[PDB]
Swiss-Prot record, chain A:
Belongs to the Mediator complex subunit 19 family. One of its GO terms (cellular component) is core mediator complex. This is Mediator of RNA polymerase II transcription subunit 19. GO terms for molecular function: transcription coregulator activity.
From Swiss-Prot, chain B:
It is found in: Nucleus. It comes from Homo sapiens. It comes from the Eukaryota. This is Mediator of RNA polymerase II transcription subunit 21. Belongs to the Mediator complex subunit 21 family. Interacts with PPARG. Component of the Mediator complex, which is composed of MED1, MED4, MED6, MED7, MED8, MED9, MED10, MED11, MED12, MED13, MED13L, MED14, MED15, MED16, MED17, MED18, MED19, MED20, MED21, MED22, MED23, MED24, MED25, MED26, MED27, MED29, MED30, MED31, CCNC, CDK8 and CDC2L6/CDK11. The MED12, MED13, CCNC and CDK8 subunits form a distinct module termed the CDK8 module. Mediator containing the CDK8 module is less active than Mediator lacking this module in supporting transcriptional activation. The chain holds residues 49 to 96 of 144 of the full protein. Component of the Mediator complex, a coactivator involved in the regulated transcription of nearly all RNA polymerase II-dependent genes. Mediator functions as a bridge to convey information from gene-specific regulatory proteins to the basal RNA polymerase II transcription machinery. Mediator is recruited to promoters by direct interactions with regulatory proteins and serves as a scaffold for the assembly of a functional preinitiation complex with RNA polymerase II and the general transcription factors.
UniProtKB/Swiss-Prot annotation, chain C:
The gene is MED10. This is Mediator of RNA polymerase II transcription subunit 10. GO terms for biological process: positive regulation of transcription elongation by RNA polymerase II; positive regulation of transcription initiation by RNA polymerase II; protein ubiquitination; RNA polymerase II preinitiation complex assembly; somatic stem cell population maintenance. Component of the Mediator complex, which is composed of MED1, MED4, MED6, MED7, MED8, MED9, MED10, MED11, MED12, MED13, MED13L, MED14, MED15, MED16, MED17, MED18, MED19, MED20, MED21, MED22, MED23, MED24, MED25, MED26, MED27, MED29, MED30, MED31, CCNC, CDK8 and CDC2L6/CDK11. The MED12, MED13, CCNC and CDK8 subunits form a distinct module termed the CDK8 module. Mediator containing the CDK8 module is less active than Mediator lacking this module in supporting transcriptional activation. Keywords: Activator, Nucleus, Transcription, Transcription regulation. It is found in: Nucleus.
Curated annotation (Swiss-Prot), chain D:
Signal peptide: none annotated. A motif (LXXLL motif 1) lies at residues 18-22. Disulfide bonds: none annotated. The gene is MED14. This is Mediator of RNA polymerase II transcription subunit 14. It is found in: Nucleus.
Length: 84, 48, 133, 50
């Protein structure tokens, strides 16, 4: 028996057969703006690590005070060692 | 080609030993399970 | 698929929001009036919309290794091809082994039939019980 | 759903952590945290998009 057709896997075959697929995630980055450098190092596995400790974030949301966000009032100054 | 030949030879070896297994068990002299009969016979020609 | 799309626009909406905030703060001049804080409001409100959007697509389950490919910037689509080659090749393993050991069953049973005459009918039963009836 | 849940809050939680440090930092240094945080946070969201 053909297991590909039995379990309805033929549609997947017609969509993901031998074709041109980038070895990286550069099929969605170009749609986004700005120069994005692929962060595929070990330090970028946080999101995997974030799931073993859900309790770090309580049920709904952390305490928030919009008034206390006045620190976002920013002057007009330059910025070295930073390129746009 | 090699899988069939090796498998067929292995099956053949089973038949070869099967014949040897059956022929040898049938070729066991003095079909007995008691030493008393043997001892009496083993005593006869010791006397001789 | 309607819910799939609905979540997608909000995700790309946030990405555009970050760029606008980043450009506004980067290109900051006195000629900007009330155009900065409004962008941040669209961000914070944008984040809240995603929480409501992830729950209608709750049924979707992402495999562990797939997110690993995403985390490292790997090729998850290639993994789908890898799985395709994985299933196709290993389907031959289960069948290939089965066929390898089925022919040994068929031929050996035929050999047992040619050595013992008095136990002929029994060997035919071995093949019958060797099938999955 | 859980994967999306954490990133939203952690970015929110990180932001709240930064909100305390920004007011008490040098004029030239406060912008570095925002730009770095925005770029770093943006990259984290790109993973979910894919």
């Amino acid at each position: 028996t053909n297991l590909i057709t039995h379990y309805n896997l033929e549609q997947a075959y017609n969509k993901f057969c031998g074709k041109k697929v980038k070895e990286k995630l550069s099929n969605f980055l170009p749609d986004l703006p700005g120069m994005i450098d692929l962060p595929g190092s070990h330090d970028n596995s946080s999101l995997r690590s974030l799931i073993e400790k859900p309790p770090i974030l309580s049920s709904s949301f952390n305490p928030i005070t919009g008034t206390m966000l006045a620190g976002f009032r920013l002057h007009t100054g330059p910025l070295p060692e930073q390129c746009r | 080609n090699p899988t069939e030949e090796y498998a067929q030879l292995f099956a053949a070896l089973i038949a070869r030993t099967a014949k040897d297994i059956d022929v040898l068990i049938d070729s066991l002299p003095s079909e007995e399970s008691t030493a008393a009969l043997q001892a009496a016979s083993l005593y006869k020609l010791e006397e001789e | 698929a309607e819910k799939f799309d609905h979540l997608e626009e909000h995700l790309e909406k946030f990405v555009e929001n970050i760029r606008q905030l980043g450009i506004i703060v980067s290109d900051f001049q006195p000629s900007s009036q009330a155009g900065l804080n409004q962008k941040l409001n669209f961000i914070v409100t944008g984040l809240q919309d995603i929480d409501k959007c992830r729950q209608q697509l709750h049924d979707i389950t992402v495999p562990l290794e797939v997110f690993e490919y995403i985390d490292q910037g790997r090729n998850p689509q290639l993994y789908t091809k890898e799985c395709l080659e994985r299933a196709l090749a290993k389907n031959e393993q289960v069948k290939g082994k089965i066929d390898t050991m089925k022919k040994f069953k068929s031929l050996l049973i035929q050999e047992l039939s040619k050595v013992f005459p008095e136990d002929m009918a029994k060997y035919r039963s071995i093949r019958g019980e060797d099938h999955p009836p | 759903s859980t994967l999306i849940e954490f990133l939203l809050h952690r970015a929110y939680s990180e932001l709240m952590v930064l909100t305390d440090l920004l007011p008490r930092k040098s004029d030239v240094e406060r912008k570095i945290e925002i730009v770095q945080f925005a770029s770093r946070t943006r990259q984290l969201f790109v993973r979910l998009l894919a």
